[PDB]
Amino acid sequence: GPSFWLGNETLKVPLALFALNRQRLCERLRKNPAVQAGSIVVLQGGEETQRYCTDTGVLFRQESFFHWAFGVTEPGCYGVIDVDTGKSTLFVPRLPASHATWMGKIHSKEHFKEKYAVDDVQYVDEIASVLTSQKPSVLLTLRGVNTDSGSVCREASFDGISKFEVNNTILHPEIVECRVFKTDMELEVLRYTNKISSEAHREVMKAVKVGMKEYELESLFEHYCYSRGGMRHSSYTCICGSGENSAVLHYGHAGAPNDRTIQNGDMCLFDMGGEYYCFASDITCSFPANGKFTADQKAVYEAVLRSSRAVMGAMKPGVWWPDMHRLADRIHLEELAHMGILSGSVDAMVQAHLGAVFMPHGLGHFLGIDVHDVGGYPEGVERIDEPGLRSLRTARHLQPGMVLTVEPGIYFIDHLLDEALADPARASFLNREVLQRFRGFGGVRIEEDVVVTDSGIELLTCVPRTVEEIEACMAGCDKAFTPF
Amino acid sequence: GPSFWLGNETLKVPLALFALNRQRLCERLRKNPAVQAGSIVVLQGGEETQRYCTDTGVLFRQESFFHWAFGVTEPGCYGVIDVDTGKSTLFVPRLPASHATWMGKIHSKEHFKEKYAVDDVQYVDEIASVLTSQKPSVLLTLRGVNTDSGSVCREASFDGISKFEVNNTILHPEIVECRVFKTDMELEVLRYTNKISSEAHREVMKAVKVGMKEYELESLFEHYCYSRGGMRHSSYTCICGSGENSAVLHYGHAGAPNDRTIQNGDMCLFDMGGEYYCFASDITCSFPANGKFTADQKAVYEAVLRSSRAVMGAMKPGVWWPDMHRLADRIHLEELAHMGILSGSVDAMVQAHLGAVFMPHGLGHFLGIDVHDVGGYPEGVERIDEPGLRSLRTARHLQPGMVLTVEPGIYFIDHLLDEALADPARASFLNREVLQRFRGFGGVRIEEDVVVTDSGIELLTCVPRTVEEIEACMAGCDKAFTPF
């Protein structure tokens, strides 16, 4: 069948991927005792947008649930699925003649049927009429709460929908649960996004020089991903934190826009991942700007390498993700004590939540069509109200087919350190005279993307990770990627 | 005073630029009979957004009127200006402590006052109190219609604004009129955006090879602009049209995403422009993919070069922009006749609006903080209801300080050609025996950015333009060209 492809060495993604997702969704809905025979799933695609009140178009990127179900790149579409038969119908805009002048060929409905391998294609202005002629019992629409943003999913609507029986509660948990478990076809795309992003991270490590601005590496990363990988989008805004900025977790946004000069002696923490056909990657590499770890840098870095590999080595079905977070906390505390930053009983440190002073974020999260993917906190799964753990984006147990980031880190964050030093329950563990040397260090994060398998995990990411590997990579002479 | 700067060789933009815009706006309002003493201009900045219902942040780019007045890069701000004194107050978000962990340093109000060189800084939640203390007569807010998008500008609002007298009609046409006329400080930025984008177009012409995907050059262009120019954004989505795609005026959007393989014998039409600190550039270069113009390609290209230079040579204060559009039309028809594509009386061709078959868009538009800049159709200035001219984005007379694109083109667009051939009023001018050869040619557009001056124009763009210059650049030749 047909495939999405951007030519050259980019990945061919079969449209069968999306057909399988539609089938899986129907199979799950059919087993839900509340779903009536004759139900039709109705999803609304994203629409084109502009900057504010201007005519400056924003590059269109499809809404994630719609993409998961249909793989459609064009704005202004709807898509429906007959639950009982699995039959799919795509609705596309009926375009004006002048589209041919300004925007390009006015493709036929048959072109879109062939392109997307759906059962039928109709025009958007006929959706009420087409759905009426199918005599559905109920329209199943999308509405629920994203547990990372707190936003409510936008429910499909169209002129005449008021004439139908509509249910907006059943679908969201079911399509979310389907998205949590990646098919082998989806895993092929995530292997690819990790491959290109890994290559781009290596090019960045080879290119970094003292004196460069952080954003020069952002630019290079995105150029590699687009020109070589066909990744027009990144999965999230690139985080290119040098020096003390490596302690800022989502550095790089408009308010802190990757605009620091990299200096000799800095650590770099680069968290970047290209997106291909709306599938994510999310990789973080940490390394010395000048290509040689100092003793202090090596110690912090290898502490995080230890937790990274201990967590990956422990992951397998049935493992409770909060236990992995706590494992990483304990290892960090052990290593920081070995370094002399901490003293005392690590058991007592753990009881006082000291780990969260150094790693205030979650160990990792589901990844898929969104970088912070859906389904981390379905009904019955509660957020743990403790330092560190409360920032976990899931408290689920691991099962095969889940895709997770594994991203421990250690940071030296002044307001968290100052709080701890003021608290007698934590201050006694902290050796101020040693810690003072690490003020302004920034931080280290090592982020891998992995798939849970029947027996353990599959690592998708492939970047240098030991101190020796990293130093060798940065010292490499290869003119394998040289823009102008 | 302070400047915006992204280091390296990027442009230092004085914050005095925005202070002058505020002063100019106040001076204009003071002369306006509808404006009373004690008025305060109130603008609301853009807010951070995310993709649909996800927590995937969209990179924040400031709203254009707010940027013009304040130059503020952070989301969530408001800004007010006392009309009688010119005193400026910036309102910034009061951030949660956790911002320090995730987003970066929580800057003081004094930091922002120094950064932006405003008279006062306050937190956004205090805006009702602060304005109440000033006992304004009326708040002047922004509401009007953008004449390119048809959108209504977003008027500022805040909790408690209902307690004030608010006028939302006075400000819009006045701040639009200020934006139409660029200050010398603004011209410095537009010179720079044209310098970087011109350099990037030259790198693209050097790098293009038969067999590449169009998006490879989009990627390279944006990489040059960001890494060398500090341009994180483009001014609009890159149009990288090869072969037949060069006849599609806004090619490159999600529905036609620069995904064609460039073939031997193709023409390329690349319309790309980096944005620096929310100031636009907009440049189009046309050239043969294989670096050598054929006779047919040279003839079409030099026709557009002739109209480009005729218009630039005729532009000066007092010229009616629709007359320049008609001048380009007449030249295109003359040259198409000289090529044998058309025959008969050119006067008669013009009377039949035949020019619009080959150039269905406007000759050019205002450019500034938006690529299609504001103020083309103020009250009293009417759109001309004729082919081609109705697509003009302004029908004003030229005045010093205006910045316009000059972008004639000739395209071979099948549905427009076929319409003409079906029309007895137009059909006899076309020679099918020659025209058939140009079916699928695509098109040529030559786009310069210029400033209207007292004596004529200042050309901002600096790219190769003659056939000889273009062939030399594509063959790798350093500054082998002399601009107009």
Ligand code: PRO
């Ligand atoms: O937001 C999150 O969960 C992770 C933490 C570090 C950056 N991304």
Ligand code: PRO
């Ligand atoms: O939209 C416009 O007015 C011009 C026409 C060609 C591309 N940009």
Ligand SMILES: [Mg+2]
């Ligand atoms: Mg990350």
Ligand SMILES: [Mg+2]
């Ligand atoms: Mg992550």
Ligand SMILES: [Mg+2]
């Ligand atoms: Mg243009």
Ligand SMILES: [Mg+2]
């Ligand atoms: Mg233009």
Ligand code: NA
């Ligand atoms: Na190197």
Ligand SMILES: [O-]
């Ligand atoms: O991350």
Ligand SMILES: [O-]
């Ligand atoms: O343009």
